Design a protein around this ligand. Structure first.
Ligand SMILES: Nc1cccc(-c2noc(CCl)n2)c1
Length: 164
């Protein structure tokens, strides 16, 4: 079946807990596979040790820039960037996992977890999974953001990987 993966997240060096994500490989296999492999680190790089660098309350929590840690970087397991696979899944509500980008066909490693329905992103960002467990952790992360996206605590993915 679809992969289940996890992010264990600290805020200011203390654990918040675990976010478990289902990756919809049935719908977006290329996009799911990228994220899965970046969680395991099996290609020699990935999310371990990287941060949630941009967090906006009542919108989303963004992470995955493991090269520049500021929203300008990251890379996929395929090369620096890869195409939008499809827009079949929609940003339906809190818990949606979706690819950040810099315009059409610029997926890399950055992603975000929505804390509200973000319908205006439909057809622009590739949705590829959702939170199975750990929305409490997501809400904590969310509570450390700001209108500008600047975080008030250092939010680190200390560990990550594949469950199934
Ligand atoms: N994948 C992704 C998501 C958000 C921003 C970016 C991005 N911004 O600047 C650059 C320099 Cl190449 N990349 C890339």
């Amino acid at each position: 079946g679809n992969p289940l993966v996890y992010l264990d997240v600290d805020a200011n060096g203390k654990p918040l807990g675990r976010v478990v994500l289902e990756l919809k490989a049935d719908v977006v296999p290329k996009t799911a596979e990228n994220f899965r492999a970046l969680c395991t680190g099996e290609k020699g790089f990935g999310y371990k040790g990287s941060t949630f660098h941009r967090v906006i309350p009542s919108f989303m929590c963004q992470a995955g820039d493991f090269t520049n840690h500021n929203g300008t970087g990251g890379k996929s397991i395929y090369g620096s960037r890869f195409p939008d696979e499809n827009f079949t899944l929609k940003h339906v509500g809190p818990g949606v996992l979706s690819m950040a980008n810099a315009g059409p066909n610029t997926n890399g490693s950055q992603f975000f977890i929505c804390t509200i329905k973000t319908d205006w992103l439909d057809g622009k960002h590739v949705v590829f999974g959702h939170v199975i467990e750990g929305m409490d952790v997501v809400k904590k992360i969310e509570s450390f953001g700001s209108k500008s996206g600047r975080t008030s605590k250092k939010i680190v993915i200390t560990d990550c990987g594949q469950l199934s």
